[PDB]
Amino acid sequence: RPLTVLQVSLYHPTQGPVAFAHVPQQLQHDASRLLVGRGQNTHLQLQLPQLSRYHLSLEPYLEKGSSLLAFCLKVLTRKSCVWVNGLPLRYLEQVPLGTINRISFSGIQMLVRKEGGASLETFVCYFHLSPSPLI
Amino acid sequence: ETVTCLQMTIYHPGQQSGIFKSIRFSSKEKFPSIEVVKFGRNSNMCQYTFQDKQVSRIQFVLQPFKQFNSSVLSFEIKNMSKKTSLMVDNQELGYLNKMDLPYKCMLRFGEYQFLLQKEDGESVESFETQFIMSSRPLL
Ligand SMILES: C[C@@H](O)CC[C@@H](C)O
Secondary structure, eight states: OOSEEEEEEEEOTTTHHHHTTTOOSEEEEOSSOEEEESSTTOSEEOOOTTSOSSOEEEEEEOOTTOSSOEEEEEEOOSSSOEEETTEEEOTTOEEEOOSEEEEEETTEEEEEEEEOOSOSSOEEEEEEEOSSOOO | OOOEEEEEEEEOTTGGGSTTTTOOOSOOEEEETTOOEEEESOTTTOSEEOSOTTSOSSOEEEEEEOOTTOOSOEEEEEEOOSSOOEEETTEEEOTTOEEEOOSEEEEEETTEEEEEEEEOOSOSSEEEEEEEEOSSOOO
16 A cells, blocks of 8 residues: 555535535645635635634644554634544644544534555545435 | 743854855744644745755754643654755654653754753643844854
């Protein structure tokens, strides 16, 4: 596997077509943080008025002794909490991602499945729009 | 509300040649706490740039965050350079290695010496940087 892959599934119970209208099929990202929110300057733009312009970020990094990228999810919104694997995170709090991640925020359900790959400079996300609940 | 300040005293043995010429000294600069502050050679990628071909286009970044059960602003530092290790006191950060910044610490990368001192403030939405000159080496 040349790149770490994040398989991302998204769900919203009532606003899918508008909320996900700008979600691409995939994004290949570098070693900078990946921004998620309703703003135009985000990498994953989700068009929900309850989101902040910058709502959360995914940061790739390396632990000492590791040959595989880790990912740190940090909350950027002041408005609400982001549940990550059972922990309700609030502004500027953060946790690392595991292999399967259940993330909910402002009605959006998001699953992130991480498959490790070799690159330490690049990763790719694939986005699936689920008609049915994920969590 | 008071604002957390990162006071960075910076030194380079060749600084008289203009290494820090784009840095404004002793002037606080305010950033949203959702910003990431980057240091490096490339002015399109970094808020703070050094006039130095030895400096990577992005050398390191400051990542503001909050510990659980804490009301103060912490900062990770992360090395972005593939070629140049970043020393935080005696801890060596390789490429994409990060760590929490102590309240007082010495940063070293190449010939650069930075003394970083964090002064907590009560604002959670903002923080400030401040740069201090040193005519003589810090280390
Ligand atoms: C005792 C517990 O309920 C609160 C502890 C403080 C440190 O947050």
